[PDB]
């Protein structure tokens, strides 16, 4: 069973990355299973909808009363030392909110870190259908 754990917002970095205080230590978290347009793309810099996705995540985390992180079944940190997790702001999963709003696509999946894959694909299908942002 996956379980949620409290964290405290330090700073929103980009649409897909947020720095949190987890277990008393500052850490950078990469949102699992989603690829958002970035403002800090290593090769492109600011992408189309990058500023929008970035503001959406920032707003969501900054205005939350409670932030919780939920690790999946596999590796919990990537190659760059970023925690890999599903982030919740007042019970709402930020990863899903972005996809539902057409501000992110479901990323290439690496088992066993795919617990919420179907949920996200479902939201992405709806966003595509509604021709939202990325899909307009």
Curated annotation (Swiss-Prot):
Residues 116-136 are annotated as: Disordered. The gene is nuc. Transmembrane segments: none annotated. It is found in: Secreted. Residues 116-132 have a biased composition (Basic and acidic residues). This is Nuclease A. The active site is at 30, 38, 82. Ca(2+) binds at residues 16, 35-36.
């Amino acid at each position: 069973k996956l379980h949620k754990e409290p964290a405290t917002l330090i700073k929103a970095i980009d649409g897909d990355t947020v720095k949190l205080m987890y277990k008393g230590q500052p850490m950078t978290f990469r949102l699992l299973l989603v690829d958002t347009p970035e403002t800090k793309h290593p090769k492109k810099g600011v992408e189309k909808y990058g500023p929008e996705a970035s503001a959406f995540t920032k707003k969501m985390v900054e205005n939350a009363k409670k932030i919780e992180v939920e690790f999946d079944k596999g590796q919990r940190t990537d190659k760059y030392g970023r925690g890999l997790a599903y982030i919740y702001a007042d019970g709402k999963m930020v990863n899903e909110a972005l996809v539902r709003q057409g501000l992110a696509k479901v990323a290439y999946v690496y088992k066993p870190n795919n617990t919420h894959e179907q949920l996200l694909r479902k939201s992405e299908a709806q966003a595509k259908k509604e021709k939202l942002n990325i899909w307009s």
